[PDB]
């Protein structure tokens, strides 16, 4: 069975420039399990991202969290890029700090 | 503590 991932990007706290926070990319509702998830700062891969919270739902779809500590600034931009077989090309979702 | 699974 093939299910395309839902990709959600969000911070732990409402963003405040200069204040430490956590950035999250939650990738959910996907199958098969093989997947590549990258967090990006200004277009560059963020090193040492933590993967956690792997689980599956009642319909067997996979869920997993990528997260990293960060301190927002006015100019820095963040995104999450995902590669999965259900998608011909990679999908990138941007952090929308005003959502 | 987890279970020791039985083969299918």
């Amino acid at each position: 069975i093939q299910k395309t991932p839902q990709i959600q990007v969000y911070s732990r706290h409402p963003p405040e420039n200069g204040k430490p926070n956590i950035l999250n990319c939650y990738v959910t509702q996907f199958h098969p399990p093989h997947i590549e998830i990258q967090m990006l700062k200004n277009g560059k891969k963020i090193p040492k991202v933590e993967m956690s919270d792997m689980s599956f739902s009642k319909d067997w779809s996979f869920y997993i969290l990528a997260h990293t500590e960060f301190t927002p600034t006015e100019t820095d931009t963040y995104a999450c890029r995902v590669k999965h077989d259900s998608m011909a090309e990679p999908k990138t979702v941007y952090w929308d700090r005003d959502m | 503590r987890g279970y020791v699974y039985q083969g299918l």
Partner: protein
């Protein structure tokens, strides 16, 4: 209230690229607490919650040995299922298992479960009675018959009623400061313009634990569950959770809509408006 111990197990083959990937992830309630991943450099069972520092080295050695044995059993199972389903050795396939138990506030068993899937579809499951199995197809019926002659349901029931319950009680005792806490949600509403003189109102709930929460939007006292958009409750990286729910309303009439938040940490539910 009630509490659960659950293990999520996945085995995924990758022909041409070596042995299958094998992972086990354990949760107490909504909190990840242990993990095993075969793709790590030196695969071992590892703590994922701070309170698991309270187990001694023997715990880790024993769980590691069990996980390595399980990894080998699932590698065989992937091969077995190729036979049952008459599939080639060149394609990737997945086995998933969810196993665990739930206890009440008094620590006594409420329910136990074990369910398997192959390639994302139901395969075999323990019935609520903890005595019989239900099989989704003829392949699983082969497994059912094997398990019946091996006395597997008795073995599993002994684990569910014994080990699982006893260890869950221990984890709740050791991890009480984390597991028995309540972190109250903090809420706010954002506003976004749309075409056609309408506005999106989004109600956010942040920083809460446990994960169960209810967010609703109301107009004139009636809930608008039909018109709402939302996301599933999601982890925020530090052991707390977040959620949002939105509604589209007419421009100029925003003040008539209210967001309601219900949670264990809110003695009186929150009511907010833009």
């Amino acid at each position: 209230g009630p509490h659960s111990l659950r293990y999520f197990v996945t085995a995924v083959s990758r022909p041409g690229l070596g042995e299958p990937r094998y992972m086990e992830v354990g949760y107490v309630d909504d909190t990840e607490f242990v993990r095993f991943d075969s793709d790590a450099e030196n695969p071992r069972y590892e703590p994922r919650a701070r309170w698991m520092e309270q187990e001694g080295p023997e715990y880790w050695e024993r769980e590691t040995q069990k996980a390595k044995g399980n990894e080998q059993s699932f590698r065989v199972d992937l091969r077995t299922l190729l036979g049952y389903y008459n599939q080639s050795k060149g394609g990737s396939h997945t086995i998933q298992v969810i196993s665990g138990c739930e206890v009440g506030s008094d620590g006594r068993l409420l329910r136990g479960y074990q369910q398997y899937a192959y390639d994302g579809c139901d395969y075999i499951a323990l019935n609520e009675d903890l005595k019989t199995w239900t099989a989704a197809d003829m392949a699983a019926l082969i497994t059912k018959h094997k398990w019946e002659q091996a006395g597997e349901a008795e073995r599993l029931r002994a684990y569910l009623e014994g080990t699982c319950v006893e260890w869950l009680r221990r984890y709740l005792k050791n991890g009480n400061a984390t597991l028995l806490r309540t972190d109250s949600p903090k809420a706010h509403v954002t506003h976004h313009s749309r075409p056609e003189d309408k506005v999106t109102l989004r109600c956010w709930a942040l920083g809460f634990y446990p994960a169960d929460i209810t967010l609703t939007w109301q107009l004139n006292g009636e809930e608008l569950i039909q018109d709402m958009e939302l996301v599933e409750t999601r982890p925020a990286g530090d052991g707390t959770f977040q959620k949002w729910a939105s509604v589209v309303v007419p421009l100029g009439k925003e003040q008539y809509y209210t967001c309601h938040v219900y949670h264990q940490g809110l003695p009186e539910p929150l009511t907010l408006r833009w």
